[PDB]
Symmetry: C3
Subunit: 282 residues, 3 copies
Amino acid sequence: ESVTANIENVKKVAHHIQKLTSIVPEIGIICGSGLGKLADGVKDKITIPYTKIPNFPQTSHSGNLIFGTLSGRKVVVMQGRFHMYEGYSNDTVALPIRVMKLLGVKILMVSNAAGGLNRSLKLGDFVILKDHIYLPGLGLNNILVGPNQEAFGTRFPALSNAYDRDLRKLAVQVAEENGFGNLVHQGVYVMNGGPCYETPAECTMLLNMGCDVVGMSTIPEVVIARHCGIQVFAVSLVTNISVLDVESDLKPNHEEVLATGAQRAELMQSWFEKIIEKLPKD
Amino acid sequence: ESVTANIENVKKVAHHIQKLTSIVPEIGIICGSGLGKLADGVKDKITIPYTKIPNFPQTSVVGHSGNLIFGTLSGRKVVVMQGRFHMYEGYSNDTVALPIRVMKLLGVKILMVSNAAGGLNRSLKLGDFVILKDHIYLPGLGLNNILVGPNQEAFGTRFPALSNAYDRDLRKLAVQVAEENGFGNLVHQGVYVMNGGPCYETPAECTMLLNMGCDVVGMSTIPEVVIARHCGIQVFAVSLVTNISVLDVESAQRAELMQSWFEKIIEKLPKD
Amino acid sequence: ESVTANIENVKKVAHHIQKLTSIVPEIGIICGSGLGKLADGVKDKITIPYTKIPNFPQTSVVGHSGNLIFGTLSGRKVVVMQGRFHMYEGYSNDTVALPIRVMKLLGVKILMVSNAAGGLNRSLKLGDFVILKDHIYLPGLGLNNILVGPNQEAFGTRFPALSNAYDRDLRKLAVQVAEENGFGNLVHQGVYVMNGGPCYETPAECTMLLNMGCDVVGMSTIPEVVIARHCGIQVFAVSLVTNISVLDVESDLKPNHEEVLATGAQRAELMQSWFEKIIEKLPKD
């Protein structure tokens, strides 16, 4: 039912947005866990409901595309994201990222909620993604399956420096200088399609594969971003500590997941704002 | 593919079955290996073909139609699925989920499932019973989880935990019954990994799966278990080792016993 | 999903091909990486564009349709697929399966396949030939096995075993031919793992796959092999190591498809020679 994320359709969506706003964003932000309040901090802003943009995908009140300034820099913010466990298509998830590219986005910043596999992690820690394992992608559910859209990128994109090392370095430096570097780690994120939380046996396997955190999002958007030459910064908020033991009473509870996210939200938002402030300006 | 497994479609299918039978089942049973057994011993049985229920999914020909048998086993009301829906056959998520959600509406509190599996754990022999204490849902991790799509909130939550998925008290009781009846030497516990199939696993795949922490591998069960736990049905599951896996490229009978095991477990189950 | 690879449709395609050629192929060959020139050197060749065969699947290289090539190679009757069907392009299971099932009805007894792969095994070098002795079908272990759906009983059984999928006698012959002709040092045997693709593998993914016991990684071949084994065609498959997998993110080395193509172009002469000399010594005839 969704529109193909080709150059024709993506240009149509982008042109419609360009009539509603003159703001040319250079940073795109996808609000996951810990970024529920990010839209508040955006100054001189214009909120465009997804329902008001023809052929743009719809998610829930409607999601919004928010243009404005954050730490003196032009941004576009997705409030409302598209998870594959909801039944959305590859084209649906890809289109907004490709729209970002045509609008002028050079850097994508994204947060998500994740289970902490690594035993040294604490609840509410930040794990900057330095790499990923795209289990769906290895198993023939990669977002790029189908004809390649050459206007955007190449058939066989490499993912060697997917999580830009310079952005990771800066994020770590900002954290350390503002007194919460002890909460910040870097690690490998593995995608579980979802929507089930991971069993103890699954978590144990994933930890032994060299995974630090597990979640149900983000990798698809990262692949599309890298495919079209957008630099990527991504960070997992550890919203549950994974249970590896089948005889343990401990278990992931979604309300506790949301509570951890909201508790850390002011800090995560402050962190993002202070990273954007320090980004090189040309 | 078929009808959506939402609260209205599942309500309609359950309501028709309740006109064809007065038995309110407390235990659901899916026969994977011991099909010819277990469905015989049910006292006062009521064989209800899948074709006699509209919107209930139908097996693909083969000269053997599926049946939903109601009755009593060891002093308890039960409903037995004779004819499963496997993902390798091409059935949709809703098709596999619907029967389990019908069981919930019919009154089922415990689902007992058996299947055929390849042994990965090196201590296993052919004919061994392996009670599942956990699983690895490879298709689920790779974006083919049965719950993908809009959540039916009337059955369960968006993000179900799979803690104590294989109820530890039911496993404890199943072990007690086996050892009390002489065949405790056959019974193991372990992790079941789902291979979507329908190919049997290569030696290299078997080696990888073994090293992932998996004891047995098969092509069914996990999807139903996930739907069962989503809607709050307790699960007991057992694999019969029907093939021992070869690990390197260089290198029926238990139907009556597993039937007896299941009958005697139900005997000792606590009743509300 | 296109036309079903059932007995009726497959027969219709096979009969259309048999009107265009009098060559009854004994050996099928899918030209992957390194086999561009092998197709070129088929003797007395009849070339049939895929466009000219009703209900045969369509694939192009920037507009130019692939070809089915009939002829001989070292005196043995062959059918060569010049142009193949990768699942990352969005082709259905039936589309990938149909050509192989057509080969079965045409008379094919052995399928030979090459491909491009990343070298996970740390002893491998760029340009090495890795004969497949086993595989790990990650899409298959998920719910994307090429045989998912109603089984076409005409071609094979519901649950095919893959125990000797990569025929051990064909592997032994291939090694012997390499040894006797002075390039045995380039020839290895290993486990191939399918990444659905089309993204190259991340460092973390490669590390995981290596620790699973995988020697090379690629985005093709296993679906065809499964269909071949399902209908009883013996299989010989070889990966050309076209990239060395990077296992650490802290490294500027990356997989680029141009150098992958350069490795295939440079080893094509030797791989062609290898396949011709294997075919010369195959059993039955």
